[PDB]
Amino acid sequence: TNILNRIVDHAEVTEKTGVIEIGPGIGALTEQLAKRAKKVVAFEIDQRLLPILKDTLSPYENVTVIHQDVLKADVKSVIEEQFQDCDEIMVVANLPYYVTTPIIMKLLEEHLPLKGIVVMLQKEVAERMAADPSSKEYGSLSIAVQFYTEAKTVMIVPKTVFVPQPNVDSAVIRLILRDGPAVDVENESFFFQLIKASFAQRRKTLLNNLVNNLPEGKAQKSTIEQVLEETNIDGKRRGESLSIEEFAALSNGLYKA
Amino acid sequence: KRQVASGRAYIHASYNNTIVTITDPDGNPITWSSGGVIGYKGSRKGTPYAAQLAALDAAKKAMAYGMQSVDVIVRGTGAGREQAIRALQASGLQVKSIVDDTPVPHNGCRPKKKFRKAS
Amino acid sequence: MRRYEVNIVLNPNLDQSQLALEKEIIQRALENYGARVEKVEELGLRRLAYPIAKDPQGYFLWYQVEMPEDRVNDLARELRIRDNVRRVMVVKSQEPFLANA
Amino acid sequence: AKVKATLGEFDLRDYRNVEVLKRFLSETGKILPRRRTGLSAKEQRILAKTIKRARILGLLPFTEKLVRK
Amino acid sequence: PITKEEKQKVIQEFARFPGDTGSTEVQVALLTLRINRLSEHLKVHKKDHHSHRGLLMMVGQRRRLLRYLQREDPERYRALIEKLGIRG
RNA sequence: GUGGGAGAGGGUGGUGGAAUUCCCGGAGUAGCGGUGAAAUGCGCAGAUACCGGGAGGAACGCCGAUGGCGAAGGCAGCCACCUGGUCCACCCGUGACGCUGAGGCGCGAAAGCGUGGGGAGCAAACCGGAUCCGGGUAGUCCACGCCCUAAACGAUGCGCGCUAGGUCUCUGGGUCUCCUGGGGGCCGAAGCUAACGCGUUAAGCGCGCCGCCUGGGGAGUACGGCCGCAAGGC
RNA sequence: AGCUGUACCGGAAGGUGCGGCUGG
Question: In chain E, what are the domain boundaries?
Fold first, then answer.
C-alpha cells in the first residue's frame, strides 16, 4: 500500500482544489485523499459494493457519492453542481485497465475545464509512453492524447497493492489539459481520418498508406504525391516520423485538393 | 405430384443440424425436412430427436407424392446419423442401398481455428 | 538417346476413319522428332474408374519409343493439341523389378 | 490373412496390370498399410508410386464408396 | 550428364602413359569438365543454391590439386594450365 | 577409374483429381447459421440441404512410419529435363596432394519492406453481438530485389585413432540363416558426471585447430562505429 | 500448458496472427 502518498504528491492537490474519483472501490484511495482536499466526489457503479462503501466513509464528511457511470453522465453537470468556488480539479482514478482507456479520451474530446489527470496504466501502454515520433510506442492514440493534453509518466510501480500477484509492471501518468489545439485544424474529422489512414499499416511506407487506406486514392496518385511534395514530406518516410505539426500541415494540404 | 415412385434420399448430418432431402433419379428434389420445420430451435435442432422427427417427415411428404423405393446416401459426421438412418429405414419404406458420403478434403483449404492442431 | 513408354488415352466415340486419321497424325508427330518405335500395343477399350471429359470410356494406345531426351518435353506438348486425345503420359522405361519369388 | 501370400508372381512397376493392382486397394480407393499387405519397405514404396501412376491414368479410383451400415 | 565416351576421351587424351587414370592431370581435367558444365547450369539456373555448394567444393578441390602440382613440378603445371585454359 | 544402388536434395517446364468459394441453368422452399447456453448475420429480387455446366486460387487425403534426404534453415500429387551430395564391390592409378580455420564470400524457418501481378480459404489491426461467435484490410501465393532473427536445440564445433556386447529398423555386397559395409533408435562392460544421465552416433581415453565464460540486476541498455529505405541487426 | 522470434493493439493485472521447442 502507501503508494497513495506518492501519487497524491504527483497530483499537486491543494485545499483549494477538488478531486473526482472514478474507481474508488473500498475507498482506501479516498481515505488518504480526504486529508488533503476540501471536495472529493466519487462516481460509483457496483450496487453490491456500495453498502460496504457507505458506512466506511462515515468518518469523513467532505465526500460525495454519485451512482452512475462516467460514460452516461455529464461531468460538467457535477462540476457545476459541487465545484462552485473550487479553483481547479484533479482526477485520481485507479480502476481496472480494460475500462480506463475510453473514459480518459472521453473526458478529453468534450474539453471540460479540468486541468489534469493522474491515473494508473500498464507500463507498456503509458499513453504509449512519451510519444516521441521515432519510436515503437508512438501511435494514433499518442496523437490523440497529445492533441488535447501534455502527458508524462512521473514513476512506475512493480509488485502489487490490490491484486495478489500480477504479471506485468504498471506506471502512473500525469496530465495537463492544454488551452487550445496544438496547430490550426480545418476539420477534426478529416484530421482523425488521415491519422488512421497513416497508421493502418505501420510497416508500409506513408505513400502506400495514403494511396490504399484513404478512400479513392487510386485516382489521386499524382495529386497525393504533388501535395506531399509541397508539404516538404518525403514519400518514403513512414507515418512514425511525421509529428503533430507535420500531420497538421499534411491535413491542411490534403484538403482543398 | 411427380409420381416418380422411386428416388434417392440425401442426409446432411452436421454437428449443429440434420437436413434430409428426397429427390428423383434425375436429381431434382421434391421435398425436404429440417429440425427447424418441426419447431425445435437452438441447440436441440442438432439433438437426434429432431432427427427422429424430420426423418419420417421426409417419408410422409414422400408417401404424399407416392414414392415407394428409396436410395439412402448420408453426408457429414453428425451425432444423429445412425438413428436417423434406422428411422427412415423403419418409416415404412424399402431401402435398397445405404452409403456414407462424408466429403473430406484432399489437404486443400485451411479450416477454422477450431479444426486446426491436427497432427 | 534413351527409351521411354508413351501412354495415350483418347475418345472412344470414333469410327474407323477418324480413329485411323488420329493414328497417322500421332505417328507422324512422333516420327518428326527423330523417335524410333519398337513395339506398339493397342488395348482398345477399358472401363474407366472415373469419367474423363464426361465419358466413362476411353481408347488406350501404348508406345515403346527410344529417342533423345532433350526433345521429350516438346513431344509431350505437341501430342496434347488434338481435342480427341484425353490423356498423354511419357515415362522412362525401367526394368521389371519382380517380388514374391 | 495377408494379401501378399495369397497371390502369384507379378510385377510391381507395371502400372497397367489392373486386376492385380485393385487387390492392393481397399473398398475405398486407399492404399492398404504395410500390415494388411505384408510387403517390405522398398516394395511398398515402389507400389505406392505405381498405384499413383495407374491411378492418374484413370485405371484405379481416387476414391470409392463403402456400402455398409 | 557426362556420358561415357567424352569422359573416356578426356582420360586417354591427358594420360601420362597408356592406362594412366589417376594422375593429377586426369583429376584436374575431369574437375574442369564438371566445373564447366555446372557453371553453365548455374548461368542458366540462377536460383539453385544447393548445387552452388558442390561447385564451390569442386573449385576448392581443383585449386588444391593445382597448388600441389605447382609446388612439386612447375613446368608441367604451366603446361597443364595452358592446355586447359584455366584463370581466363 | 570401372560396375551398380537408394532417396519428400535443389531448379525449370507442364498437368491429375478431392474440397471450399463464386457464376449460369434445373427442381424445391420456411428457415439457415452458429455456442455450455445464447445472440450478430444470410433469406420471398426464394437461402441451406440437391443435380448439372463453367471460373479462379491455394494445398496435396490413404501410402506415412519410431521412415528417408540435406551442412543447416528445411524438403512429400504425378511426369519430363538439368544438377549436387553419398554408399557398396573390384583393390586398377597419383604417392601425403591432409585437418582446422581469425577476416572475406555464399546460404539462411517464420515475421517484415520495395517495384509489379494475383487473391478461393484463413486471418493481425479494425467493424458488430453475450459479455466465445459473425464479417473484414494488410499478410499468407508468384517474379525480381532487400531484411538476416529464433527454444536457428541433440540447449552437445570440426577431423582422426582406441575401448564388452544385446535388440529393433533403413539401405548395399557375398560362399545365405549366416558373414561383411554405411545410416537411424533402444538397453547396457569398463569408464566419466554434482546428479539427472552419457556410454563405438560418448557427455570415456587422447591429439590437432577455431569460437566462447569470469557473480545477480542494471542490460543486450547508453555513447561510438558498420550495415539497412524503415523496423532493426552486429 | 508454458516459453520463444517477429508484427500489431482508441475495451492492454495482457490480447491476437504467422511459425518453432519441451525446459508440459
Answer: 1-88
Beta strand C98-99 pairing with D10-11 = antiparallel
Sign of CA dihedral A147, A100, A126, A20: positive
Assess contact for C86 and C57: CB atoms under 8 A: no
How is chain D split into domains, by residue range?
Answer: 1-69
Number of domains in chain B: 1
Contacts of residue D69 in chain B, CB cutoff 8 Å?
82, 85, 98
- Domain residues for C35? 1-97
Pairing of strands C2-10, C59-67: antiparallel
Q: Are C49 and D7 within 8 A, CB to CB?
A: no
Helices (H), D1-69: 18-21, 34-37, 41-56
* Among the partner residues C46, C50, C97, nearest to D12 by beta-carbon distance: C97
Residue with cell 504498471: A170
CATH code for the domain of B42: 3.30.420.80
Please list, in sequence order, all residues whose beta carbon lies within 8 angstroms of the beta carbon of residue B72, skipping any fewer than 6 positions away: B8, B9, B11, B85, B88, B89, B95, B97, B98, B99
* DSSP-derived secondary structure letter, A220: G
Instruction: Read off the DSSP letter of residue B34.
Output: B
Residues 37-56 (D) near nucleic chain F, CB < 7 A:
40-42, 44-49, 51-53, 55-56
Q: How many whole angstroms separate alpha carbon A79 and alpha carbon A196? A: 33
Check: CB of residue A206 under 8 Å from CB of residue A225: no
Residue type, position A189, single letter: S
- Tell me if B63 is assigned to some domain: yes
Rounded distance between C-alpha atoms, residue E87 and residue E66, angstroms? 12
- In Å, what is the CA distance from A229 to each residue of A185, A207, A233, A234? 20, 11, 6, 7
Determine phi and psi for A41, rounding to 5 degrees.
-120, 135
The residues, ordered by sequence, that sit 6+ positions from A184 with a Cβ below 8 Å of its Cβ are A248, A252
How many residues does the structure list for chain D? 69
Taking each helix axis from N to C end, the angle separating A188-198 and A244-254, rounded to the nearest 10 degrees, works out to 110
Q: Is A94 annotated as a binding residue?
A: yes
**Is the residue at B21 inside a domain?**
yes
Give Cα B24 distance to the centre of its chain.
15
How far, in Å, CA of B40 to CA of C92, rounded?
A: 63
The C-alpha atoms of residue A135 and residue A241 are separated, in whole angstroms, by 9
E strand or H helix that includes residue A81:
helix A75-82
Alpha-carbon distance of B18 to B46, in angstroms, equals: 7
Domain assignment present for B66: yes
Strands (E), E1-88: none
Q: How many CB atoms lie within 10 A of CB A40?
A: 24
Instruction: Please report the resolution in angstroms.
Output: 3.2
Q: Show the cell assigned to C15.
A: 469410327
Among B82, B85, B99, the residue with its CB nearest the CB of D66 is B99
> Does B1 map to a domain?
no
Angle at E42 between CA E38 and CA E43, to 5 degrees: 110
User: Are the CB atoms for C79 and C85 separated by under 8 Å?
Assistant: yes
Closest C-alpha to A53, from A23, A26, A21: A26
A186-223 burial, b for 16+ CB within 10 Å, e for fewer?
eeeeebbbbbebbbbeeeeebbbbbbebbeebeebeee
